[PDB]
Amino acid sequence: LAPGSSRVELFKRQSSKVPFEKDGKVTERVVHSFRLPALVNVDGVMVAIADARYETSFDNSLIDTVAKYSVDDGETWETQIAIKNSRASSVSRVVDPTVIVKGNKLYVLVGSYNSSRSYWTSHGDARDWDILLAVGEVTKSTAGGKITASIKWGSPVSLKEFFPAEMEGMHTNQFLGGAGVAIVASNGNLVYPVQVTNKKKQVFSKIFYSEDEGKTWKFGKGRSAFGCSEPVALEWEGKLIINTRVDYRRRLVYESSDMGNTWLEAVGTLSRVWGPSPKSNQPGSQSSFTAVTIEGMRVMLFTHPLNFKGRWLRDRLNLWLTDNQRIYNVGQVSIGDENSAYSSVLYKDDKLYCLHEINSNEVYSLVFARLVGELRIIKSVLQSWKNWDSHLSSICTPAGCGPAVTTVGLVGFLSHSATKTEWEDAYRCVNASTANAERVPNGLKFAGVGGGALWPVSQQGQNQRYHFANHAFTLVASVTIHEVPKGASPLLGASLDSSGGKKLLGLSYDKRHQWQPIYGSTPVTPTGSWEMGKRYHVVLTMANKIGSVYIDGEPLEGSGQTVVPDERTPDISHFYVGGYKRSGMPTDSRVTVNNVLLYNRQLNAEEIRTLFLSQDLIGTEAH
Ligand SMILES: OC[C@H]1O[C@@H](O[C@H]2[C@H](O)[C@@H](O)[C@@H](O)O[C@@H]2CO)[C@H](O)[C@@H](O)[C@H]1O
Ligand SMILES: CC(=O)N[C@H]1[C@H]([C@H](O)[C@H](O)CO)OC(C(=O)O)=C[C@@H]1O
User: Where in this chain does the record put each Sialidase domain (predicted)?
Assistant: First the structure.
């Protein structure tokens, strides 16, 4: 928890009580565990929803859906049960509650079981299952001079009639919501991401929506891959963005422009970025994922635990910030090495809060946190992004001004800032490490066996922000060479292994004053010429498994070659700059490099000429 932020234990394990109703009688009852938190804002009133696990934390036991609410931003709360289970046996339950806010109503979706003691994904049929919808109505009043509020909960309705017996190539079994909070799309529709089983017991995700305020429901035709569960969704620039959990694997994210009729993997932005454990081979988790507007810029907020300990413990809850381009680690929200899996984040009247799980010996509470510090840091990063995007967009490029320098899809920038061992990211997400570097205006100058810089890719570890590079990228720089080499030496490139011996795409130079471009594993043909002391402009592109190299804006011989054998998907290790940064490799490069830019797509020709023509104008030096 950052400096300046604080919390309280709100749903207190083995302490807080709720109004348990049975046989027309109501009694205040102490609860063992609270889980599956969901935190929202209804027209001025804060509401918190979750699971009340009466007797034990075991998933298949006695559970009702509880609610708490406040009109003073979290100093005081009232308590109630919003949805009760069927009362048929000692293990009846309503599970995984998923919430939508619209006008002054709360729409809550839950599964309902009568008596099974087995985990739901292992049932062979639906004999014990039902799926339901309850609506709560929120009204405000002021009797006494001070604000008040009440909430009236309606009886649940089954939506079973809207589940077809068959989908494309399978037979249906059961379905449930994805937990946490869902959304109202910009056309008015109610939209719930859902998880479904079929008769072979495989799990997968769909879109489940309503056009008549929840009176009827439909399914979109498409689906995620088998193995994706507990999905969570938001709306961005006209698409639904669906974010999934996959046990024992890196997380998959999908895009859809038509209410779920067609699904496409987000290879160029967010898919495969977040892993469930340092080696990504442990159970996954539930996540909060919303779109909000801060100081006039729209952005996304996402949380997930790092799970250093393993299995289901899921310690160290982290918060991330992104604009669908750059991706920044806000930090750790939980405290110390405690266990902390599920979570919910809310932005209200310009303040940030989080409701989340804590776990000691399989006994669970929900704490409520005021994230004053997290928001401070966020605002600082958003200003820096806005400032550098504005600076670059305002430069008068030469012919009266030519076309503008592009910032769409720009991800990283290495320029004037540097310490003794790092080259700093102007966008503040990923730095590069260095050796034998001497600082100069807007760049670095290297020399000797072992010199150069390294901008990590798969080397980032658990969470990999530049995974898009395995699908498409553009890399740009200015360079000058100071000594004719003995053999062939490296200048800039993308490497598949950690030495730099297995290249995907790169550029070197040799003793006969020629360039040596390198296309994957293809045999190397030297070409063109250069003079010492002369400044040159360099660009590398890769898309659709094809790579290119430009000098001063023009493509060299051999451009247009295959860099990925149609076989698999590349796993890039790092980009190397002005050397391999490896003492064990024999080359010695004596060169200066300035202003390195990284983009998540292949640039167009006009975009390349402007960048070339405007080299002397973009450094960060004056600021
Ligand atoms: O740690 C609590 C979680 O248990 C998970 O269930 C595990 C269970 O702990 C393990 O012993 C074995 O039975 O495999 C189960 C996975 O299906 C639940 O999935 C999770 O909801 C937590 O309750
Ligand atoms: C078991 C169940 O009905 N609810 C569980 C839920 C569920 O498995 C998922 O929503 C569908 O796979 O997830 C988890 C979990 O962290 O493993 C805890 C919930 O108690």
Answer: 37-357
Q: How many whole angstroms from 243 Cα to the centroid of ligand 2? A: 16
Tokens of 285: 């988790």
**Beta bridge partner(s), residue 80:** 67
Strands 180-181 and 93-102: parallel
**Looking at ligand 1, which atom is closest to the CA of residue 311?**
1
Ligand 1 contact via 312 beta carbon (within 6 Å): yes
**Collapsed DSSP state (helix, strand, coil) of residue 397:** coil
Tell me which method was used to determine the 3D structure: X-ray
Ligand 2 atom 9: the closest Cα is on which residue? Answer: 230
Q: What residues does each domain of the chain span?
A: 1-370, 371-623
Structure-token pair, residue 592:
């200066």
SS3 category, 187: coil
Q: Are 592 and 445 in contact (CB under 8 A)?
A: yes
φ and ψ of 28, to 5 deg: -70, 110
Q: Is 128 in the pocket of ligand 1 (CB under 6 A)?
A: no
d(CA 416, CA 432): 13
CB 231 within 8 A of CB 224: yes
Rounded Cα gap, residues 541 and 549, in angstroms: 7
Which residues does 590 contact at the CB level (< 8 Å), separation at least 6? 446, 447, 448, 481, 482, 483
Atom 15 of ligand 1: nearest residue by CA position = 119
Contact 524, 481 (CB under 8 A): no
Ligand nearest to the CA of 60: 2
Report CA(59)–ligand 2 centroid distance (Å). Answer: 7
Alpha-carbon gap, residue 299 to 39, rounded angstroms = 19
Phi, psi of 422 (to 5 degrees): -130, 150
| CA 119–ligand 1 middle distance (angstroms) | 8
Per DSSP, the three-state class of 154 is coil
Which of 282, 312, 358 best tests ligand 1's pocket when mutated (most atoms within 8 Å of CB)? 312
Cα of 57 vs centre of ligand 1, distance in Å, is 10
Architecture of domain 1-370 in CATH?
6 Propeller (2.120)
Q: How far apart are CA 457 and CA 464, in angstroms?
A: 7
Q: What's the CA angle centered on 161, arms 159 and 167, to 5 degrees?
A: 105
* Rounded distance between C-alpha atoms, residue 462 and residue 228, angstroms: 19
Q: What is the DSSP letter of 462?
A: S
* CB contact at 8 A, 194 and 231: yes
CATH 2.60.120.200: does it fit domain 371-623?
yes
Residue nearest to atom 1 of ligand 1 (CA): 312
